[PDB]
């Protein structure tokens, strides 16, 4: 998230990015997006053709120009805060001393070693990334003493304190939860909220000891005061230290980052291959020619010549060098690809930010990404030097690795990018650079129903700041066409949801060759996967959260169908229980949703109750109008007349706070004592875990004032009077009035002589007063309802709801709201990190290569999952499709039953007989959507009434709709006699 | 799809209907809507019957069914609109395992034994805990005024 | 021409709605037929919310419009 | 038939010593992990030595030696 400690250091850092090829451009773009204060580029070499297949900043008109100078304009335009300068000299000690990070991207071994030694000598973090075809390389050295300050991507833990006793151990017990198991002995803890133990707050962090049955201790608390109740205990992180060997030393004894042992051996082979390539470049001057058989033999010979004793002596290799691997790497080491560049640039920029902000565990000096699977299989034709020969097109970087045939196959494609938020935008960049649909026989399509926001454009490159309001689809299409002039993007604004099944149906999905879904929800992903399964279309799905990332491919009939986490899909749109709202928000999250929904029901419905409904057809004689008027009018002031007073004061805010917390809690206590239940009399536990107290406002405390400000500003904005921010003068005014309540204690509750109002004792006088207030509001100005807007800070919504939640949770003894809960809330969500977005986009680009390549086995495809904070990356081949069977019928999750209708449309009996005989299955329930067509427990009369009819006519008669003009198939779900409540039979495609 | 599961549940429950529930029916057009006559056992609700309406969202069984008392019923934790605060239906105790049969059994228990722990009508819950005699008075009146005649 | 009208309860029940007739005089009849309070849900096509003061011609109600309503509020 | 103690690693930099058996199933391991971490089974999966774990196979096939860290990976929704 946005941590001020780390962000203060981020802006004050300076990073040099040498060798600004495609990989360097990716690293610089990610750094600029994340907001690195200064960025000195360095690449005096002229732009070539092969740099136009991976680098997006350079265009065709920037040919024969310095890459750094050409990219400077666009890189500065990306974010104005970043001061992207270009250095035209040479990498000298004076230059290296001033910077904080130095990234040599795609630089020769000589320069790598020289700059690495120079940087490791003084203080400078050094990275050396390089992509050679389909294999990457990253090295990170951060000196002999680099102290990370927060080694995990997790908020410090917090737990509600139940009770603490005094003694030598000072054992305290806490409420049951996952935090009880999470807490471990030897940790470090602090305390901030507690009733009792006054000076224990703000004390030094202290260790703990874990005992059985979830027993914890703090130490010696006997000397201290009495303890009433416990708010929370917070864990404290322990700064770690790392020492990295310099480059010249680590090049001999590499320490690779891997999650296995076989992968470590594979990375050792890759490292040997890269060293062989560097030695070849030093011995011959030129890189290996594209797919040249002669050069590959020289490279593998050099790999053998590389010292076998160069390897570690404490662990001999199980087998000598992998000749096949080295030969393949040499053969494909000609060009530079766009997805690989995105992936490695994402990882390198994440490492640079790790170095800059002293956050997250840094990489252990070596990472090797292998993606050779995208090459054609053994049986198929490997690309030749003749078609890999460069011609002069922008895609000759890709050609030198894959071939002109593959380039043409990529060019002749139709795809459908569903969603272009952030992953969609970067997938669009990858598609434009690759050449997906850049011909006349191909094309593209972008589907988005949103509009650019000031919050979204923060870390997005396709969207500018002058586009707020215009559709994301249209802006992304324009950006993609600007990137690749030959591309044909067709922006569509209509979303992909079950309602819009007449636009995106048959005719639409018949042209598309694949689908790429970068969506921000689970239900949308499940729907898109269902459509892709129904139409048998390849699907590429990505998802990011913080520094997490997932990229998956679901090719039909080879890979398992996408299955959504139904629990989370339902949780996305689900109401919260009302018991916590009424009397027990046991946690800060329930008190938060209580505040949100209480504000919603008090403001949004107020606008409709003042004017529309009252003035149109109804009066106080409706179901309960007095209650609706009471929940809004008196709590916001007696009023009853046109308010000539300024709508920005404290007279009504404090009364509302009194009614919200103090009066509410007192009323609840009068309803039932906090310790006893009247009906129970002698319950199992008298007052179990519930002891609410009324709160008294303190002017000094910040939460109470911030709530007052927020309420006053929002009320002014809502009534329409120009509201001024109280934080300058009116906060001091409300502090100047310390005791407005003692003079207005009794009358403000209800009318003038209603201390408690008993039960419906308000009477006709109060009813007529409410009616008069309604009439006055109806003849007065209309209050305008407002929605939850995170971008507009002036509305004071997030602060108001957070303050209310904190106040009520402290009233109930609940620990205060933390930023983690607000982040977990769907609203006020943080943008995805540019690094993980680029990583998933690059992995999806590799999957696109594999998909476009043609008919491929399942073992060729890979699903990837990464976590950049922990440097944990996996790329695993996916499972086979599930095989479900009932009796003699066998099926998977992709196949479908296809029964024809016939020129004379068959009847229900005909369809049933066809099923029963052909596929040997006796149908018991035949559903069309949510419409029954034939049961088995149905009465014989009903069966003889429905059965003689025909299916198309029956659907008409039941639904009341008509067959769609151009309808091709009707999907019906069928069950069987004697089947389990889990077996899902394949959907029946009645071919009408 | 949840529709097949709902159809299977209704067909299973029709052959052995619970004693307190009669004419558990649904329209073939929309099978995710059950109509039923709750028949209480404990007075004064024992006199009449109440038509309820169970609605199954397409996310079933991962989304609790919504129960609404179409007939006006005098219950401390049932709103005049017919909404019900059954603990299992609330999104804190819901599991896909729990069936609508169990939910309806809990509903019968709730109707026969008025609840005060979670009052949807806190006002009337207060009147209940203060003057249960006045509560029986209004209960009898509302049952005889709105309740549907009890079928055989 | 026919325009797809659907309800949030799973039943479409398409109704005769034309551009030559004001949308208000048709939505009031639809709400009266359904029986649910209009303030519960706002009718919306393609994701564009509808306001009491909002011209439909500016947003261009498409034939076969994807009009659907979203449940709101908290009755209980 | 002898039991072992694996260390399931939570997604927020935490580990926990579960006591399982080589004759159990990844489904049982997932149930224990879910129960301890307050997460739904269908929302997360768990991986070991890079490769993921199918929740229908015994843990013996996957080579879980004692004192092993089975990572827990969450299904991501942000886009
Ligand atoms: O990059 P991100 O995570 O913000 O992605 C969100 C984008 O996805 C689009 N989206 C979300 N859901 C859908 C559906 N159902 N159909 C089409 N597009 C969709 C958002 O509009 C956003 O651009």
All domains of chain B, ordered by start, with CATH? 2-146 (3.10.110.10)
Alpha helices in A522-662 (DSSP H): 522-534, 566-572, 579-582, 588-607, 613-616, 625-630, 651-657
Coil/strand/helix, residue D71: strand
Kindly state whether residue D33 falls inside one of the protein's structural domains. Answer: yes
User: Closest by alpha carbon to A45, among A22, A23, A66, A70?
Assistant: A66
Distance A567 CA to ligand 1 centre (A): 20
Q: Could you tell me the two tokens for A133?
A: 């075809």
Catalytic residue among A125, A579, A660, A809: A579
Radius of gyration for chain C, computed over Cα atoms and rounded to the nearest angstrom: 12
CB nearest A495 (choices: C6, C14, C47): C47
Kindly state whether residue D55 falls inside one of the protein's structural domains. Answer: yes
Q: Could you tell me the two tokens for A893?
A: 């999750």
Pair A223, A251 in one domain: no
Question: B139 and B45 in contact (C-beta within 8 Å)?
Answer: yes
Residues of A with CB under 8 A from a CB of C: 449, 493-495, 497, 499-500, 502, 575, 578, 597, 600-601, 605, 608, 612-613, 930, 959-961
- Range B66-71 contact pairs with CB under 8 angstroms and sequence separation of 24 or more: B67/B103, B67/B107, B69/B38, B71/B146, B71/B147, B71/B148
Q: β-strand A101-104 against A125-127: which pairing, if any? A: parallel
CA distance A632 to A613: 16
Count of domains forming chain C: 1
- Structural domain harbouring C7: 1-76
Kindly state whether residue A594 falls inside one of the protein's structural domains. Answer: no
Count of domains forming chain A: 5
Which chain A residues have a beta carbon less than 8 Å from that of D79?
419, 421-424, 518-521, 542-544, 832
Pair A135, A269 in one domain: yes
CATH of the domain at A300: 3.40.50.720
Q: Is A288 in the pocket of ligand 1 (CB under 6 A)?
A: no
User: Closest by alpha carbon to A129, among A244, A36, A28?
Assistant: A28
Pair A454, A349 in one domain: no
Coil/strand/helix, residue A9: helix
Pair A685, A784 in one domain: yes
CA distance A500 to A505: 9
In this structure, the residue with its CA closest to atom 19 of ligand 1 is: A419
Crossing angle between the packed helical segments A338-357 and A834-853, to the nearest 10 degrees: 160
Are D13 and A154 inside 8 Å of each other by CB? yes
Closest residue of chain A to D18, computed from CA coordinates? A181
Are C75 and B55 inside 8 Å of each other by CB? no
Pair A222, A341 in one domain: no
Q: Could you tell me the two tokens for A967?
A: 């309808």
Where among A316, A334, A357 does a domain terminate? A357
In our burial notation (b when 16+ CB lie closer than 10 A, e otherwise), range B27-49 reads ebebbbbbebbbbbeeebbeebb
Listed in order, strand segments (DSSP E) in A95-218 are 101-104, 125-127, 130-132, 135-137, 140-141, 146-148, 158-159, 161-164, 171-174, 188-191, 194-196, 206-207, 216-217
C32 at the B interface (CB within 8 A)? no
CA distance A587 to A589: 5
Q: Could you tell me the two tokens for A355?
A: 């170095």
Q: β-strand A863-867 against A548-554: which pairing, if any? A: antiparallel
Q: What are phi and psi of A242, to 5 degrees?
A: -135, 140
Are A872 and D71 inside 8 Å of each other by CB? yes
DSSP A78-112: H-SSSEEEE--S---HHHHHH-SEEEE-S--HHHH
> How buried is residue A285: exposed, middle or buried, by Cβ count under 10 Å (0-12/13-18/19+)?
exposed
Q: What's chain D's length in residues?
A: 79
Chains C and B touch (3+ CB pairs under 8 A): yes
Which chain D residues have a beta carbon less than 8 Å from that of A518?
79
Question: How many CB atoms neighbour CB A837 within 10 A?
Answer: 30
Which chain C residues have a beta carbon less than 8 Å from that of B58?
10
> How buried is residue A549: exposed, middle or buried, by Cβ count under 10 Å (0-12/13-18/19+)?
buried
Q: Could you tell me the two tokens for A744?
A: 């207005």
Residues 6 or more apart from A601 whose CB is under 8 A from it?
Answer: A631, C73, C74
CA distance A5 to A915: 68
> How buried is residue A671: exposed, middle or buried, by Cβ count under 10 Å (0-12/13-18/19+)?
middle
Are A872 and D14 inside 8 Å of each other by CB? no
Distance from the C40 Cα atom to the nearest Cα atom in chain A, whole angstroms: 10
Are A931 and B7 inside 8 Å of each other by CB? no
Pair A722, A859 in one domain: no
Are A932 and B31 inside 8 Å of each other by CB? yes
Q: Is A420 in the pocket of ligand 1 (CB under 6 A)?
A: yes
CA of A518, closest atom in ligand 1:
5
Kindly state whether residue D37 falls inside one of the protein's structural domains. Answer: yes
Pair A348, A264 in one domain: yes
CA distance A103 to A18: 6
Write out the catalytic residue numbers of B.
85
Side by side, the strands of the sheet bearing A897-900 are A897-900, A988-991, A970-974, A926-928, A931-934
Assign residue B19 a region (left: φ > 0; alpha: ψ between -120 and 50; beta: otherwise).
alpha
Q: Could you tell me the two tokens for A577?
A: 């229980």
Question: A257 and A363 in contact (C-beta within 8 Å)?
Answer: yes
CATH of the domain at C43: 3.10.20.90
Residues 6 or more apart from A102 whose CB is under 8 A from it?
Answer: A15, A16, A18, A96, A115, A119, A124, A125, A126, A127
Query: Which residues of A are annotated binding-site positions for ATP?
Result: 422-451
Pair A325, A353 in one domain: yes
Is residue B48 within a helix (H) or strand (E), and if so which, with residue range?
Answer: none
CB nearest A520 (choices: D11, D38, D78): D78
Pair A221, A291 in one domain: no
Assign residue A825 a region (left: φ > 0; alpha: ψ between -120 and 50; beta: otherwise).
beta
Listed in order, strand segments (DSSP E) in C1-76 are 43-45, 67-69
Chains D and A touch (3+ CB pairs under 8 A): yes
CATH of the domain at A935: 3.10.290.60
User: Closest by alpha carbon to A812, among A512, A537, A581?
Assistant: A581
Question: A299 and A280 in contact (C-beta within 8 Å)?
Answer: yes
In the Cβ-directed half-sphere of A172, how many Cα atoms lie within 13 Å?
A: 27
Pair A289, A189 in one domain: no
Q: What are phi and psi of A955, to 5 degrees?
A: -60, -45
Pair A140, A169 in one domain: no
Kindly state whether residue D79 falls inside one of the protein's structural domains. Answer: no
Pair A454, A502 in one domain: yes
Where among A236, A269, A293 does a domain terminate? A236
Q: What is the DSSP letter of A336?
A: B
Please, what is the end-to-end C-alpha distance for chain B in angstroms? 36
Question: A656 and A633 in contact (C-beta within 8 Å)?
Answer: no
- Structural domain harbouring A107: 4-150+243-357
Kindly state whether residue A782 falls inside one of the protein's structural domains. Answer: yes
Q: Could you tell me the two tokens for A430?
A: 């990858």
CB nearest D77 (choices: A154, A521, A865): A521
Coil/strand/helix, residue A146: strand
User: Closest by alpha carbon to A267, among A376, A136, A398?
Assistant: A136
Which chain C residues have a beta carbon less than 8 Å from that of B33?
9-10
Coil/strand/helix, residue A802: helix
Q: Is A457 in the pocket of ligand 1 (CB under 6 A)?
A: no
CATH of the domain at A672: 1.10.10.2660
User: Closest by alpha carbon to A717, among A634, A641, A783?
Assistant: A783
Side by side, the strands of the sheet bearing B21-26 are B21-26, B33-38, B50-55, B66-69
Q: What are phi and psi of A210, to 5 degrees?
A: -90, 125
Is residue A667 within a helix (H) or strand (E), and if so which, with residue range?
Answer: helix A663-671
Are A578 and C76 inside 8 Å of each other by CB? yes
Q: Could you tell me the two tokens for A845?
A: 């680009």
Kindly state whether residue A825 falls inside one of the protein's structural domains. Answer: no
Distance A821 CA to ligand 1 centre (A): 23
Which chain D residues have a beta carbon less than 8 Å from that of A152?
12-13
């Amino acid at each position: 998230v946005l941590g001020s400690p780390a962000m203060q250091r981020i802006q004050g850092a300076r990073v040099l990015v040498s060798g600004l090829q495609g990989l360097g451009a990716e690293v610089a773009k990610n750094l600029v997006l994340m907001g690195v204060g200064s960025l000195t580029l360095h690449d005096p070499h002229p732009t070539c053709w092969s740099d136009l297949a991976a680098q997006f900043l350079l265009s065709e008109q920037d040919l024969e120009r310095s890459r750094a100078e050409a990219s400077q304009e666009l890189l500065a335009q990306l974010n104005r805060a970043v001061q992207v300068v270009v250095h035209t000299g040479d990498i000298t000690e004076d230059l290296l001393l001033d910077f904080q990070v130095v990234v040599l991207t795609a630089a020769k071994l000589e320069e790598q070693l020289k700059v690495g030694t120079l940087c490791h000598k003084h203080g400078v973090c050094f990275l050396a990334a390089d992509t050679r075809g389909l294999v990457g390389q990253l090295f990170c050295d951060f000196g002999e003493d680099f102290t990370v300050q927060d080694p995990t991507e997790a908020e410090p833990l917090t737990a509600a304190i139940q009770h603490i006793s005094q003694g030598s151990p000072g054992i305290l017990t806490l409420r049951k939860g996952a935090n009880t198991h999470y807490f471990r002995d030897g940790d470090l803890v602090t305390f901030s909220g507690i009733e009792g133990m006054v000076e224990l707050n703000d004390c030094d962090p202290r260790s703990i000891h874990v005992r059985e049955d979830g027993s914890l201790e703090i130490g010696d608390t006997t000397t201290f005061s009495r303890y009433l109740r416990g708010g929370a205990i917070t864990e404290v992180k322990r700064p770690k230290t790392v020492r990295h060997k310099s480059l010249d030393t680590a090049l001999l004894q590499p320490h690779v980052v891997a999650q296995s042992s076989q992968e470590v051996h594979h990375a050792h082979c890759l490292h040997q291959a890269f060293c062989a390539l560097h030695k070849f470049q030093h011995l011959h001057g030129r890189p290996p020619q594209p797919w040249d058989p002669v050069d590959a033999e020289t490279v593998v010979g050099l790999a053998r010549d590389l010292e076998p004793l160069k390897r570690t002596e404490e662990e001999p290799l199980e087998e000598p060098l992998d000749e096949a691997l080295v030969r393949t790497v040499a053969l494909s080491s000609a060009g530079v690809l766009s997805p690989m560049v995105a992936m490695l640039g994402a990882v390198a920029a994440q490492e640079v930010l790790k170095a800059i902000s002293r956050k997250f565990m840094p990489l252990d000096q070596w990472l090797y990404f292998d993606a050779l699977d995208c090459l054609p299989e053994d049986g198929e034709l490997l690309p030749s030097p003749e078609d890999c020969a460069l011609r002069g097109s922008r895609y000759d970087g890709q050609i030198a690795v894959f071939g002109a045939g593959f380039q043409e196959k990529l060019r002749r494609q139709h795809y459908l990018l569903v969603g272009a938020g952030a992953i969609g935008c970067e997938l669009l960049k990858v598609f434009a650079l690759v050449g997906l649909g850049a011909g006349n026989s191909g094309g593209l399509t972008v589907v988005d129903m949103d509009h650019i926001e000031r919050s979204n454009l923060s870390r997005q490159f396709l969207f500018r700041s002058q586009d707020v309001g215009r559709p994301k689809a249209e802006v992304a299409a324009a950006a993609a066409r600007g990137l690749n002039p030959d591309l044909q993007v067709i922006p569509l604004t209509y979303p992909l949801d079950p309602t819009t099944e007449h636009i995106y149906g048959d005719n639409f999905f018949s042209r598309v060759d694949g689908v790429a879904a970068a969506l921000d929800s689970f239900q949308a992903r499940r729907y898109v996967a269902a459509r892709c399964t129904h139409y048998l279309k390849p699907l590429l799905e990505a998802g990011t959260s913080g520094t997490w990332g997932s990229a998956t491919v679901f090719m039909p009939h080879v890979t398992e169908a996408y299955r959504a986490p139904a629990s989370a899909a339902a949780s996305e749109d689900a109401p919260y229980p009302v018991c916590t709202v009424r009397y027990f928000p046991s946690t800060a999250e329930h008190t938060l949703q209580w505040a949100r929904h209480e504000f919603e029901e008090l403001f949004r419905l107020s606008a409709e109750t003042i004017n529309h409904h009252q003035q149109a057809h109804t009066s106080l004689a409706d179901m309960d109008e007095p209650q609706t008027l009471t929940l809004l009018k008196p709590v916001l002031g007696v009023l009853r007349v046109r308010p000539q007073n300024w709508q920005d004061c404290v007279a009504w805010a404090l009364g509302h706070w009194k009614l919200c917390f103090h009066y509410g809690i007192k009323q609840l206590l009068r309803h039932f004592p906090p310790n006893k239940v009247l009906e129970d009399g002698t319950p199992f536990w008298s007052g179990p875990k519930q002891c609410p107290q009324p709160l008294e406002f303190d002017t000094n405390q910040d939460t109470h004032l911030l709530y007052v400000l927020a309420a006053a500003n929002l009320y002014a904005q809502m009534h329409g009077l120009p509201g001024s921010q109280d934080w300058t003068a009116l906060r001091e005014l409300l502090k100047l009035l310390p005791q407005p309540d003692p003079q207005q204690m009794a009358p403000i509750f209800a009318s003038n002589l209603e201390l408690a109002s008993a039960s419906a004792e308000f009477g006709p006088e109060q009813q007529k007063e409410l009616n008069k207030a309604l009439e006055v509001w109806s003849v007065g100005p209309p209050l305008k309802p407002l929605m939850f807007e995170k971008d507009d800070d002036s509305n004071f919504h997030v602060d108001f709801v957070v303050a209310a939640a904190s106040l009520r949770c402290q009233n109930y003894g609940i620990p205060p709201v933390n930023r983690a809960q607000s982040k977990r809330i769907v609203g006020q969500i943080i943008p995805a990190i540019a690094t993980t977005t680029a990583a998933v986009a690059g992995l999806l680009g590799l999957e696109l290569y594999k998909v476009v390549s043609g008919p491929r086995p399942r073992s060729a495809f890979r699903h990837s999952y990464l976590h950049l904070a922990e440097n944990y990356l996996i790329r695993y081949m996916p499972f086979a499709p599930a095989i479900q069977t009932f009796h003699h019928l066998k099926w998977t999750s992709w196949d479908r039953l296809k029964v024809p209708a016939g020129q004379p449309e068959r009847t229900l009996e005909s369809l049933l007989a066809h099923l029963q005989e052909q596929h040997g299955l006796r149908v018991r329930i035949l559903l069309h959507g949510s419409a029954l067509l034939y049961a088995a427990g149905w009465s014989p009369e009903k069966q003889a009434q429905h059965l003689p009819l025909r299916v198309t006519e029956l659907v008409q008669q039941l639904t009341g709709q008509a067959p769609a003009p151009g309808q091709r198939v009707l999907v019906l779900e069928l069950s069987c006699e004697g089947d389990d409540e889990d077996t899902a039979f394949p959907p029946l495609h009645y071919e009408l | 799809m949840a529709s097949m599961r709902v159809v299977k549940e209704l067909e299973d429950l029709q052959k052995k209907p619970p004693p307190y529930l009669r004419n558990l029916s649904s329209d073939d057009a929309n099978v995710l809507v059950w109509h039923a006559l709750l028949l209480p056992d404990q007075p004064p609700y024992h006199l009449k019957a109440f038509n309820l309406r169970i609605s199954f969202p397409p996310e079933y069984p991962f989304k609790p069914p919504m129960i609404k008392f179409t007939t006006k019923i005098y219950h401390p934790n049932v709103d005049e609109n017919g909404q019900i605060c059954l603990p299992i239906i609330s999104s804190e105790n819901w599991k896909p395992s729990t069936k609508t049969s169990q939910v309806l059994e809990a509903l019968n228990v709730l109707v026969n034994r008025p609840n005060i722990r979670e009052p949807k009508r806190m006002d009337l819950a207060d009147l209940l805990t203060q003057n249960p005699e006045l509560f029986r008075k209004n209960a009898e009146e509302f049952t005889l005024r709105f309740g549907v005649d009890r079928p055989s | 021409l026919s325009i797809l009208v659907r309800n949030n309860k799973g039943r479409s029940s398409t109704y005769e709605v034309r551009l030559t007739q004001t949308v208000a005089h048709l939505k009031q009849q639809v709400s009266g037929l359904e029986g649910v309070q209009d303030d519960l849900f706002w009718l919306t096509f393609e994701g564009k919310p509808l306001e009491d003061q909002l011209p439909l011609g500016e947003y261009g109600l498409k034939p076969l419009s994807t009009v659907f309503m979203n449940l709101r509020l908290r009755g209980g």
